[PDB]
Design a protein around this ligand. Structure first.
Ligand SMILES: O=P(O)(O)Cc1ccc(Nc2c(-c3ccccc3)nc3cc(-c4ccccc4)ccn23)cc1
Length: 438
């Protein structure tokens, strides 16, 4: 495969469903490269656990933790890291209220080159144990020889775009990583970077981030096909923000409109949203505790009941993962019979305005609250018009894209409800024998 899209290993599926999955210990293994230093961008960290995932021989190499914690939360993270003198921290600035540092990325500097890993998991044991999570593994990028002047740039502009994403932090530890990236050749990269950073973007910057970045890439590097209005949009996520009083406020006005863009010329497009039901969570490998990583609150949900008529169950027989609750987030554009896709995105971004951006100032400004990061797979970047959908995720005819859950998505039944984490479920016990009492 050219795609280098992986799921994380799941404890409690048959070996055939972990063949070609990756655990964090595999990503950090000496087989992937001889580690010199690393940067871990994330939201949540268990530092004691994290250090143990590195090979023993690499555990004293410098590690930078890039986080967004403030006040007592920041103090707690510093206290976690203080025993490890090789660990440095970078607090990403969050100058708009209610934003988070949500990006999940590893920068892995080796004796042999550089690797970038953009993924969906927090750095805690539970996120790598029984969840469905997604990973994009970059190629091993070689160093550009000193005295050689070359760009090291890919046709997708990934090198400059990654440097642009890091430059937005205005952080000295990350300028050091920018200088590392400048010294490497990233020209083999076949994915497009889609980041969000906090800010209010106008004019020459509105297309840099969030859903306007997606829109721009789709305008420039995808083409429209006949009957495009029949090609659905699928969004798949593990958290839901406050989207407004009806679908016209954000979801089906600006967000869907970006997602349905194809090509450069100027809606009945079906919108599928995949989000675990209560029954998905109850019968999951983790049971109700899976719902601690699905933080949809009743205060939010009761303001937007209109949204749940878009919701489809989690189902992943294709990857043996129907009972491994999703923390991956994905967005894609399948054909009307779901046999092909026009593009696929794996990202940290959930279904929220904070992550994707909301237009302000009479549509002239895009405001984003958070840091997010994902990679976009476009057929044109592979010499193709569309991707075939892989019938079985771990099977083997490889310009076929490995979609990790089942198509078509299945609508909630009349008795299903979205998982809402702060109300009790005491009607039926979970796979461990327990109820859920927040
Ligand atoms: O796929 P088929 O045709 O049905 C053939 C088939 C039938 C039964 C199993 N049972 C099974 C499961 C299993 C089962 C059901 C749910 C979850 C996990 N996990 C394992 C792991 C090993 C193992 C042994 C040594 C070293 C490393 C791994 C052996 C068996 N395991 C596996 C395959």
């Amino acid at each position: 495969n050219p795609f280098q899209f992986y799921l994380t290993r799941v404890s409690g599926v048959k070996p055939k469903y972990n063949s070609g999955a990756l655990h964090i210990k595999d990503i950090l293994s000496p087989l992937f490269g001889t580690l010199v230093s690393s940067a871990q961008f994330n939201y949540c960290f268990d530092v004691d656990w994290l250090v143990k995932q590195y090979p023993p021989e690499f555990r004293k190499k410098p590690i930078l933790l890039v986080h967004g914690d403030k006040r007592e939360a920041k103090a707690h993270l510093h206290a976690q890291a203080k025993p490890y003198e090789n660990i440095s921290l970078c607090q990403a600035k969050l100058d708009i209220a209610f934003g988070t540092h949500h990006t999940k990325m590893m920068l892995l500097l080796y004796e042999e080159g550089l690797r970038v890993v953009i993924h969906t998991s927090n750095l805690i044991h539970a996120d790598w144990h029984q969840k469905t999570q997604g990973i994009w593994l970059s190629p091993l990028y070689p160093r550009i020889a000193d005295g050689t002047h070359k760009s090291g740039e890919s046709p997708t502009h990934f090198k400059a775009d990654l440097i642009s994403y890091l430059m937005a932090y205005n952080a000295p530890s990350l300028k050091e990583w920018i200088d590392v990236i400048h010294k490497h050749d990233l020209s083999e990269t076949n994915v497009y970077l889609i980041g969000s950073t906090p800010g209010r973007f106008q004019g020459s910057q509105k297309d840099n981030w969030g859903h306007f970045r997606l829109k721009k890439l789709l305008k420039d590097h995808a083409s429209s096909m006949p009957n495009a209005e029949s090609w659905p949009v699928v969004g798949q996520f593990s958290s839901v923000g406050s989207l407004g009083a009806d679908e016209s406020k954000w979801l089906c006005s600006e967000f869907k409109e970006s997602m349905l863009t194809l090509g450069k010329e100027s809606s009945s497009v079906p919108l599928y949203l995949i989000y675990p039901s209560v029954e998905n969570v109850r019968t999951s490998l983790e049971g109700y505790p899976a719902g601690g990583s699905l933080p949809y609150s009743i205060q939010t949900a009761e303001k937007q009941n209109w949204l749940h008529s878009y919701f489809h169950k989690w189902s992943a027989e294709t990857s043996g993962r129907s009972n491994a609750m999703p923390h991956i987030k994905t967005y894609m554009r399948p054909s009307p019979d779901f046999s092909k896709i026009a593009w696929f995105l794996v990202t940290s971004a959930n279904l929220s305005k904070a992550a994707w951006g909301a237009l302000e100032k009479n549509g002239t400004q895009l405001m984003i609250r958070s840091y997010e990061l994902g990679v976009l797979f476009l057929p044109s970047a592979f010499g193709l018009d569309s991707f075939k959908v892989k019938q079985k995720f771990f099977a083997g005819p490889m310009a076929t894209f490995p979609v990790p859950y089942d198509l078509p998505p299945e609508l909630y039944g009349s008795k299903d409800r979205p998982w809402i984490w702060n109300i009790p479920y005491v009607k039926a016990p979970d796979t461990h024998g327990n109820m859920w009492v927040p």
